[PDB]
Design goal:
InterPro entries: Ank_repeat_dom-contain_49, Ankyrin_rpt, Ankyrin_rpt-contain_sf. One of its GO terms (molecular function) is transcription factor binding. Helices cover 51% and strands 0% of the residues. By secondary structure, it is mostly helical. The longest helix has 10 residues. The chain is elongated.
């Protein structure tokens, strides 16, 4: 498909490595020329998962942190699209782990919302802030708890993510775990220090949001 008004962007998106290599080597300025969405060949190669094209552009020494018109960096694009090897390559060239797009999302928010375990680890090994808050003051942990992703909760706890940050509705990840009936996630969160006392904007603790017996189980875990 024609994703760009820029030839080199279409070549990068469609995985046309040799043609892209010919064009840029012939005119190295094409490597950083931007299209209608303010994207270069790097953004499109990240989107379509063309690792070798990404590696080519990085070895050329293109910038790795330029944002398109929606605030997306290559690292956002690679993390969202589940491009494990490209995320590794971008972190190897000092990609901004804590960059935010126009929704205030970091690459880790996307790793969390799409259950991308290996990418979350690479981002966190790379200095990602586990407590980065989006425009709704929500964290990676809010997403993991809401979706019931135990493996992702273990990753975020290992890298020292807080369990008690309130989003704009006053909900901690434990409120969301209780509301979505994520029983084993709720119990893990409490066992690791998630507060049963914090009230959301409806003046409810996680115990009060919890349904059918979960509230008493969590209360007993903290109070005996």
């Amino acid at each position: 498909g024609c994703v760009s008004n820029l030839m080199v962007c279409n070549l990068a998106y469609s995985g046309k490595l040799e043609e892209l290599k010919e064009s840029i080597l012939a005119d190295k300025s094409l490597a950083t020329r931007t299209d209608q969405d303010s994207r270069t060949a790097l953004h499109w190669a990240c989107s379509a998962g063309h690792t070798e094209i990404v590696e080519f552009l990085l070895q050329l020494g293109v910038p790795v942190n330029d944002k398109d018109d929606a605030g997306w960096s290559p690292l956002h694009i690679a993390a969202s699209a589940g491009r494990d090897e490209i995320v590794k390559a971008l972190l190897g060239k000092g990609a901004q782990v804590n960059a935010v797009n126009q929704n205030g999302c970091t690459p880790l928010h996307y790793a969390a919302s799409k259950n991308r375990h290996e990418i979350a680890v690479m981002l966190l090994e790379g200095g990602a802030n586990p407590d980065a808050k989006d425009h709704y003051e929500a964290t990676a942990m809010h997403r993991a708890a809401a979706k019931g992703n135990l493996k992702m909760i273990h990753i975020l706890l290992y890298y020292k993510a807080s369990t008690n940050i309130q989003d704009t509705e006053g909900n901690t990840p434990l409120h969301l775990a209780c509301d979505e009936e994520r029983v084993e996630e709720a119990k893990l969160l409490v066992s690791q220090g998630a507060s049963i006392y914090i009230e959301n904007k409806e003046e409810k603790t996680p115990l009060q949001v919890a349904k059918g017996g979960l509230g008493l189980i969590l209360k007993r875990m903290v109070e005996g």
